[PDB]
Symmetry: C2
Subunit: 434 residues, 2 copies
């Protein structure tokens, strides 16, 4: 018999190595690694290698990787739930933060902490009851998450006097706290009539984070285990996708001024509430339902509708990437999940998604407007939730919000451990570029 | 006859689009190097974003479409009574590039007064905040919650051409601007939410005057405070894009989140101790100095305290810049305001600010650690508010929040008129930098 370390202790063990690596990179401070062009200034920094992000790197052949591991490696190696086939988001968080795969026992102890720390102050429940029905769900989520800054250990510690070398410890604490609480907050956004019951309902401390999220959404018990596996997979896959995306970047940006994790990830959610970032899954579902509606329920069928769409100036949602040359491995992971659930395979709406994925890439290639027109993860995610009875697309981004806490919180902990300074680029006006 | 603000903006849009198109012809032109230092130093020195309204001149300080603070003091419309320039006039300049007439500003002021009421749900939201909640958190949340009233969110959902994105963005920007003073006043006055929240404003008075009225400093007896508030709000409106509140607003806004969600994100950055605490820090330090050296100090007494400060390792707040070689002209504008008010001149605390501004630069130059050691605007601003009876420094960032709506909202309107894309830099990990 031997002792197994908790998440904080595992993080502490890999901190010195990262600091040694950081110090070596600093010796190369003057080394040139690229050029700033006018294109980069007016194209929202596109292709400008200008920020640090430890947890995930996009490989152009294999897609997103987490400390060098593919989605397929993660599905195989990361710990599962006490029931189910899919990898756990808490395990993904552990991997993102430490660079190492946790044992099963380590993940269970982490899950338990997350269940025990999930309760909300009374003032947050009052805040949520104040929201009108017309308020966008993503707005409700961003606000409620910011409001949890009342519970921030970092805010309080920084005010009192705190060593720069130790800024990470309170940041970690708040990150775990945020993580514990956010599923509950999301469930209250889904269920505005049940705030008092859902807001205080005790969780089963022996179950995983995704299971408990499902329970607070009204989908608990063994009868909903298929949904539990979807939710686990979905949450793990959307946790991190580099630093350049707006929710990750905004979190890093705001956090670099030493706003605590609650205020920082709030800012990330505000970016995620943007139609060009987080509402892609909702847009795809809408477009698939509109397509089913026009063709009813009739391989060659789909092609006419696609061509009709492109020749009218509209885009096919859920298709394309600027760098990835193959289908998004996260998309593939959602279809592998579908492949073993016969009932999802029999849903007409998923059948329509699947046919379109086998036909649209050829069609979009021949049309030539969009480079790398392969399905991305947003093609599939909406339909899967729709199958399990989440039929209001407005809330899809809320689920992405929960998931997307994982990666940016990890980077925030590392930003503070490494002592990274405030993000301060230099602006210029158009006249100044002549 | 004279145009309204929207029509004045419309007239200058095509010229900017023509200029943008010329800058695009030069897209391949190199304008800098990316070094490892830039990646790990949060993009410092990396000329990588567009910002139309303000450019920092290293000799003359911040300039607004080529105009110095002194040009603005001379040329911009004042209030119906009062010596200081109006923030509404500054907004007009920032947005159009042109100085409005007096009649144009009065019509703009009236629109801002007419649009200042809040939905009941925002008042309910604010009553839910506990007393312990940081005032900047309250402000960010309340601003986000106004996204219920966003014309852009609604218009984008319904179908809206890219060429017209600016019109609803403008509308929401004016709406946010109208409402934010009231929101800030509710943050200052949590006991008076019902009365302050619905109190009718004088539609013939300027924006700053109405802010002062809702803060409890209305009437003829507070005219001098009114002039300070006008000046303060106008001067802090815009200071390039690289600062965290401006940048976060642009960032989130580039995903097409509306101005309410975007400026909320800016406020979350502003709530960061590395961004919004400078005025508070200076006031505390000036009061500590007065406590040590008294009211009847000599030049040697001031010089001695500064030396004692620097030889103990501490920094003098409000002094120094990386680029600007003269005193901040915004600082000078606050001292020009003081120069005509005999009572401010007689306050020992202001006398200490003024003396320190004449002595500390010499002292900091000789000490050698601080680069360009001239006063910036934060040297003066706190003491001025403290003179007029704003003695709660925790709320000075809220006032900065109100002011700092002006510039970032202007940029957002231009971002949408020009069709600028989403902000998406490229990240790399430390191992990728070796």
């Amino acid at each position: 018999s031997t002792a197994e370390p908790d998440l904080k202790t595992a993080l502490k063990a890999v901190i010195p190595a990262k600091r040694e690596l950081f110090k070596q990179v600093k010796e190369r401070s003057d080394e040139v690694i690229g050029e700033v062009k006018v294109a980069n200034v007016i194209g929202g920094m596109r292709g400008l290698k200008s920020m640090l992000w430890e947890g995930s790197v996009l490989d152009p052949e294999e897609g997103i990787r987490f400390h060098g591991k593919t989605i397929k490696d993660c599905q195989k190696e990361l710990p599962k739930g006490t029931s189910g086939t899919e990898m756990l988001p808490e395990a993904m968080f552990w991997l993102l933060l430490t660079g190492q795969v946790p044992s099963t026992n380590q993940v269970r102890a982490f899950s338990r902490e997350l269940a025990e720390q999930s309760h909300l102050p009374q003032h947050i429940l009052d805040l949520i009851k104040s929201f009108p029905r017309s308020m966008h769900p993503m707005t409700q989520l961003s606000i409620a998450v910011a409001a949890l800054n009342t519970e921030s250990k970092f805010a309080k510690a920084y005010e009192k006097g705190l060593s720069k070398a130790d800024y990470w410890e309170p940041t970690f604490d708040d990150s775990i706290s945020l993580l514990a609480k956010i599923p509950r907050v999301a469930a209250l956004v889904f269920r505005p009539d049940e705030v008092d019951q859902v807001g205080t309902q005790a969780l089963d401390a022996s179950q995983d984070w995704s299971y408990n999220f499902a329970e607070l959404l009204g989908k608990g018990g063994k009868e909903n285990q298929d949904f539990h596996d979807l939710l686990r997979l979905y949450l793990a896959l959307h946790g991190d996708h580099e630093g350049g995306n707006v929710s990750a970047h905004a979190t890093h940006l705001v956090g670099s001024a030493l706003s605590d994790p609650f205020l920082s990830y709030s800012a990330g959610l505000l970016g995620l509430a943007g139609p060009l970032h987080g509402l892609a899954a909702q847009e795809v579902l809408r477009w698939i339902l509109a397509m089913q509606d026009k063709i009813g329920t009739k391989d060659d069928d789909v092609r006419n509708y696609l061509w009709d769409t492109l020749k009218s100036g509209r885009v096919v949602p859920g298709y394309g990437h600027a760098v990835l040359r193959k289908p998004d491995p996260r998309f593939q992971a959602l279809m592998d999940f579908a492949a073993t659930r016969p009932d999802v395979l029999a849903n007409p709406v998923f059948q329509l998604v699947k046919k379109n994925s086998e036909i649209a890439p050829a069609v979009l290639t021949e049309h030539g407007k969009t480079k790398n027109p392969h399905p991305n993860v947003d093609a599939a995610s909406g339909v899967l939730f729709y199958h399990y009875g989440f039929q209001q697309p407005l809330y899809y981004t809320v689920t992405f919000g929960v998931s997307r806490a994982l990666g940016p919180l990890v980077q925030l902990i590392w930003d503070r451990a490494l002592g990274l300074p405030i993000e301060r680029p230099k602006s210029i006006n158009l006249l100044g570029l002549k």
